[PDB]
């Protein structure tokens, strides 16, 4: 019938792009049919054949986003990745203060955490 994704992940880019161009042509002529006759059997294959192009462009994008992520998410020098792949999070969660600060303290403020820590005393 159509492309089943559980068996479609294992395919490759060059094997997908020939898988793709064939569902396009198949839908290309299903929109020829949709013009002239009704032919619900000749027709009616659109909504499965049009959501199979969807789950091929999906896996295509699901992959070449990872290949361009296992290439940019690297310890490489000056590690500036395109902002479309950088962990997206709201404009202010991106500016606010990371974990490595907002917990950072001077000298003469570390040293009281040691001299005079907070205790777990109990009252009788």
């Amino acid at each position: 019938h159509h492309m089943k994704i559980k068996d479609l992940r294992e395919k490759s880019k060059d094997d997908l792009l020939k898988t793709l161009t064939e569902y396009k042509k198949e839908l290309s002529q299903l929109r020829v049919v949709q013009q002239t006759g009704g032919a619900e059997t000749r027709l009616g294959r659109i909504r499965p054949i049009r959501k199979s192009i969807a789950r091929i462009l999906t896996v295509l994008n699901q992959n070449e986003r990872s290949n361009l992520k296992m290439f940019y998410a690297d310890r490489k020098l000056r590690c500036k990745t395109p902002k479309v792949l950088r962990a997206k999070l709201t404009h202010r969660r991106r500016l606010a203060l990371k974990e490595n600060e907002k917990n950072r303290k001077t000298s003469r403020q570390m040293r009281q955490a040691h001299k005079f820590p907070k205790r777990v005393y109990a009252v009788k």
């Binding site: 161009t21 396009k24 002529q29 020829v32 949709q34 013009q35 994008n61 070449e64 986003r65 395109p82």
Partner: protein
């Protein structure tokens, strides 16, 4: 790059020519003339309807007249070089 999304050779040629047209005038121009009628996408190009024809229907196109219908849909008349009979494509394309 500012993107990752894949592209191909297909989507560049199947988005332009979307479906042919069958009317009293769109039929009268396949037989009498050698034109075809495709409802191309609106933001296409007369030079890229020719390329798309040749990429989809391996026929030459000489004159590609277009018009954005009063539906927002861009029609396209396409002379087939007088060497590819149009009545042999509508029967192939299944018009």
């Amino acid at each position: 790059s500012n993107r990752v999304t894949v592209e191909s050779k297909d989507i560049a040629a199947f988005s332009v020519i979307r479906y042919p047209l069958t009317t009293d005038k769109a039929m009268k121009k396949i037989e009498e003339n050698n034109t075809l009628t495709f409802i191309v996408d609106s933001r296409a190009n007369k030079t890229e309807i020719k390329k798309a024809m040749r990429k989809l229907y391996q026929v030459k196109a000489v004159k590609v007249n277009t018009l954005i219908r009063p539906d927002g849909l861009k029609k396209a008349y396409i002379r087939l070089s007088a060497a590819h009979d149009a009545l042999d494509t509508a029967n192939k394309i299944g018009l």
